[PDB]
Design a protein around this ligand. Structure first.
Ligand SMILES: Cc1ccccc1CNc1nnnn1C
Ligand SMILES: *[C@@H]1O[C@H](CO)[C@@H](O)[C@H](O)[C@H]1NC(C)=O
Length: 341
């Protein structure tokens, strides 16, 4: 089990002003550290956030969090469940800021809620340095869904933070799962993100900010636009037919118009990954994520995700029999036989 620690700096808070925190399981024989960002959509105005506080309160507050959590999938310490990093130091950072991990705004007399996702990540890193992170060789910042987009928005800031604090030997890398979205046309008929950024005082990576300029920071929430601006190594996991993408696209006996729409979506996603050398993109319709216990089962071209991640580790020391760029080319959901059932 991973044990809860509420942040010692209690001014770094969840939406309702309660302290943020992290769950930790140490592995003293390892210099690898995995910091995982939870997902769960976002909220973008007072009324929408009030609704989320009524029925999704754990995503807005630490008041009811349990003392422990079980590590699963890539967070499991069992070699059979996690062939990749079973012996690593494990950290799960709960998502309680509703801001895609981008915010830097406290509660005040003018703000009902605090949006501190970017500050939560930096404070977790700072407090872990005194618990053994100072001796790390690799810090892998991973996350799923909104947490996968959070990786893209925060990995370079973590690298800069450790350099400025005096830890130049720690290699910072990112693993973005299910957070690579397209700003495409809906099947049946970006603004919420634009409103959200203003509501949150949201921040984006500096090189991406300088390309798109004032008012256009929303562009940096889209993987294919922010990824080329990043300096840290980043591995991208993305289903070609992601269920969250299809939900925003208003897709739910398929006739020609919808067949062409779905085929074009897969082709567009595959195109955006052509120049991403570390990636795993199976041709599946799914909402499943990398902390599930059976994450080992899917394969692309005969290679599993735990294997591809191991090959990525070797590449950062091409490799015979150890590939890192794995994107399906078949054009319809479940044309890969290993897709989750
Ligand atoms: C970045 C993020 C994080 C969580 C939930 C949604 C989103 C962006 N929304 C969106 N826009 N076009 N497709 N999708 C899914
Ligand atoms: C706690 O965090 C806030 C926001 O990041 C910061 O202003 C403050 O200085 C921190 N306190 C300490 C003691 O570092």
């Amino acid at each position: 089990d991973l044990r809860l620690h509420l942040l010692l700096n209690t001014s770094v808070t969840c939406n309702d002003g309660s302290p943020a925190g992290y769950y930790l399981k140490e592995s003293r024989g390892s210099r690898r550290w995995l910091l995982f960002l939870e997902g769960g959509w976002y909220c973008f105005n007072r009324e929408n956030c009030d609704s989320r506080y009524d029925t999704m309160r754990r995503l807005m507050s630490s008041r009811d969090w349990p003392r422990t959590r079980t590590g699963t999938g890539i967070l499991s310490s069992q070699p059979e469940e996690n062939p990749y990093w079973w012996n690593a130091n494990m950290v799960f950072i709960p998502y309680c800021s509703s801001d895609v991990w981008s915010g830097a705004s406290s509660k005040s007399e003018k703000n009902e809620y605090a949006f501190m996702g970017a500050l939560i990540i930096q404070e977790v890193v700072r407090e872990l340095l005194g618990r053994g992170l100072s001796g790390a060789k690799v810090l892998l910042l991973a996350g799923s869904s909104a947490g996968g987009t959070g990786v893209l928005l925060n990995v370079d800031r973590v690298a800069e933070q450790l350099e400025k604090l005096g830890y130049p030997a720690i290699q910072v890398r990112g693993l973005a799962d299910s957070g690579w979205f397209l700003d495409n046309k809906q099947y049946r008929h970006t603004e919420a993100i634009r409103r959200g950024i203003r509501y949150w005082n949201g921040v984006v990576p500096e090189r991406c900010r300088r390309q798109f300029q004032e008012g256009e920071e929303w562009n940096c929430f889209f993987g294919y636009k922010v990824y080329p601006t990043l300096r840290s190594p980043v591995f991208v996991v993305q289903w070609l037919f992601d269920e969250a993408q299809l939900t925003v696209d208003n897709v739910h006996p398929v006739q020609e118009g919808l067949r062409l729409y779905i085929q074009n979506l897969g082709r567009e996603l595959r195109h955006t990954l052509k120049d991403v050398p570390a990636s795993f993109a199976p041709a599946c319709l799914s909402h499943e994520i990398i902390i599930r216990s059976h994450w080992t089962d899917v394969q692309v071209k005969g290679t599993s995700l735990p294997r591809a991640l191991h090959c990525w580790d070797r590449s950062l020391h091409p490799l015979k029999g150890c590939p890192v760029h794995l994107v399906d080319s078949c054009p319809w959901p479940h044309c890969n036989p290993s897709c989750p059932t």
